[PDB]
Amino acid sequence: VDSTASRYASALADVADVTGTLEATNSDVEKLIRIFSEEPVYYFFANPVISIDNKRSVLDEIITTSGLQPHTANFINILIDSERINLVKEILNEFEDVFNKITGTEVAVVTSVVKLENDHLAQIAKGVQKITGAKNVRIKTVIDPSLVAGFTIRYGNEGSKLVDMSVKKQLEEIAAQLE
């Protein structure tokens, strides 16, 4: 994807990569996402009517308490100057996808009714890695009542590529007979 929100996030990651603050910058970006969740805080930055000069002063105070990275404080200042603070939320979310690309980590998300031990995951995370082509795999877990007793892992560029077996066997059987 290449949209304005994605474009900005990619720049932010590239500067971190150059300066070797990828771990350090990522923590700050995660820290920002908590900040901009709040309807009141986001609204203040986003709306055109509040004066830009006031926004910087408030932003500076926010940065100090937060203790953000020197570029990360710039990056928000750049967004504010160039009017794209209305799409901060899209930009922050976009950065996580870019950050995995730079490392070579890949997310997978694996779904069960029942919580599973690391050993099963270790096989899956190794399994997604070879199948992925990954340098590294980072695993995301979710709990679902609806399937049966299996699970489905999703991976790829997006969460596009899903390979599952739990409910799906029942569905396949239902289809199979009608043939």
């Binding site: 994807v1 590529k161 066997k169």
Partner: protein, 502 residues
């Protein structure tokens, strides 16, 4: 109708022999659905044209593969689809289950029967967008494809592997000409497909009923996408018909496919691309509207003797608005095809039926598509008629015109009276040869124009009955030999004398 006692065996059968193979399948998320089109997030493994299946159970086509999302064009209406649901990438790119058993069945745009006569037995499969035969793969058109319309088969001949367009106004007689052609291939051993794009459901039913009464449904497939159906289906209806025709074509069979109209296809493709926000062109048609037809109509070919010498004659039909051939879609389809047949309402109201405007009708194959006996007789007929009109229009501007012109206005008005035919009164090629031989050689220069229609009918019956040898020469040798000519002359004189007595 006893079902319940075998269900305990039947239910077990379904579970029996089930592989349950697990393979990686592409999946994505629905962002938007509105009016025939979904915008799919994800699916970074789909290919341009791949069928993608929605959660409810709808098959859509991934046309736009944008960098953020995927433009999916639903084959149906996605009332059920819900924002956030998951859609699968099937892997196939719009195949058709195609076999021998489609004959005599009205079928859907997706090729599932809609006459309610049972599921079709289809072993093979073919793509919808298969590439056309190559340049080295074809051969020249030589075989006749008879319409039974004396105005077509004498002056605008249609040959196997050809593409003749039938263009006219609304209610000008275009469908009747096409339908007549399919009805006329009763024992010529060709397969016919009638694709009905965007046509009224009642109208399509009427055509099917007419075919059935004639017995023409023993070799005809009717593919129908009615007006009510989603634009996608209308857009893909012609392709499905071609795929069916192509299957027979590669089995060395000869096929004829009528697409009724192609104009309602490109409206259905204008609708698809305008809702995908593709940038339009003239009359909001997409840029690639010419390409949509051209790739379809170039499927119609006569294959070489290496590839079985099968053929596929396409018969587009594109109706023009109040004689406006300058419109954007009729401009595109004329230049693709191998000659057009203009039908005109001005000749249709003036009795001249089928209303072939022969002046603007063209056959780009020419007299290679005629049998030799007919080619000899009507070879220069096409030009003479055009030349004759030029001075019919000009001798209304003279008062005292000489006899040498008055002979040509005599003969030329007789030649027009050959060409008129009652609907669904097809002529054998024998009956066309002796009709054109009579008019060209001045044997109608005696009698009145009103009498000419009557005289020819009497004459044809005469030679069916009294002289079956003329049938034998033209049907076997396919050449208007001196013996055949002599028989025709004898018969003409006898008939003329009988007519004089009456």
């Amino acid at each position: 109708t006893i079902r319940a006692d075998e269900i305990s065996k039947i239910i077990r059968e379904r579970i029996e022999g089930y592989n349950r193979e697990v393979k990686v399948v592409n999946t994505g998320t629905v962002l938007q659905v509105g009016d025939g089109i979904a915008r799919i997030h994800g699916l970074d493994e789909v290919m341009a044209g791949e069928l993608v299946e929605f959660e409810e159970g709808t098959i859509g086509i991934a046309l736009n593969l944008e960098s953020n999302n995927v433009g999916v064009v639903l084959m149906g209406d996605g009332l059920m689809i819900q924002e956030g649901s998951s859609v699968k990438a099937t892997g196939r790119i719009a195949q058709i289950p195609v076999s021998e058993a489609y004959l005599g069945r009205v079928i859907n745009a997706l090729a599932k029967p809609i006459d309610g006569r049972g599921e079709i037995t289809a072993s093979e499969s073919r793509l919808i967008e298969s590439p056309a035969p190559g340049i080295m793969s074809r051969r020249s058109v030589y075989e006749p494809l008879q319409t039974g319309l004396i105005a077509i088969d004498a002056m605008i001949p249609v040959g196997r592997g050809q593409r003749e367009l039938i263009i006219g106004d609304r209610q000008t007689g275009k469908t009747a000409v096409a339908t007549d052609t399919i009805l006329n291939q009763q024992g010529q051993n060709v397969i016919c497909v009638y694709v009905a794009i965007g046509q009224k459901a009642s109208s399509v039913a009427q055509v099917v009923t007419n075919f059935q009464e004639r017995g023409a449904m023993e070799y005809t497939i009717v593919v129908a996408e009615t007006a009510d159906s989603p634009a996608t289906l209308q857009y893909l209806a012609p392709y499905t018909g071609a795929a069916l025709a192509e299957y027979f074509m590669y089995r060395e069979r000869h096929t004829l496919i009528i697409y009724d109209d192609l104009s309602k296809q490109a409206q259905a493709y204008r609708q698809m691309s305008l809702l995908l926000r593709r940038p339009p062109g003239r009359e909001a048609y997409p840029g690639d509207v010419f390409y949509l037809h051209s790739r379809l109509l170039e499927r119609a070919a006569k294959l070489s003797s290496l590839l079985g010498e099968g053929s596929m004659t396409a018969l587009p039909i594109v109706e023009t608005q109040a004689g406006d051939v300058s419109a954007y879609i009729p401009t595109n389809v004329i230049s693709i095809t191998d000659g057009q047949i203009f039908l005109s309402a001005d000749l249709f109201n003036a009795g001249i039926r089928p209303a072939i405007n022969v002046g603007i009708s063209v056959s780009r194959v020419g007299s290679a598509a005629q049998i030799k006996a007919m080619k000899k007789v009507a070879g220069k007929l096409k030009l003479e008629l055009a030349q004759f009109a030029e001075l019919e229009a000009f001798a209304q501007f003279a008062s005292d015109l000489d006899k040498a012109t008055q002979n040509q206005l005599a003969r030329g008005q007789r030649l027009r009276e050959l060409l008129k035919q009652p609907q669904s009164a097809p002529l054998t090629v024998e009956e066309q040869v002796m009709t054109i031989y009579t008019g060209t050689n001045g044997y109608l220069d005696s009698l009145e124009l009103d009498q000419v229609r009557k005289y020819l009918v009497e004459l044809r019956t005469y030679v069916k009955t009294n002289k079956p040898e003329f049938q034998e020469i033209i049907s076997s040798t396919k050449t208007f030999t001196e013996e055949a000519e002599a028989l025709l002359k004898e018969a003409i004189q006898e008939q003329m004398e009988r007519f004089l007595l009456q």
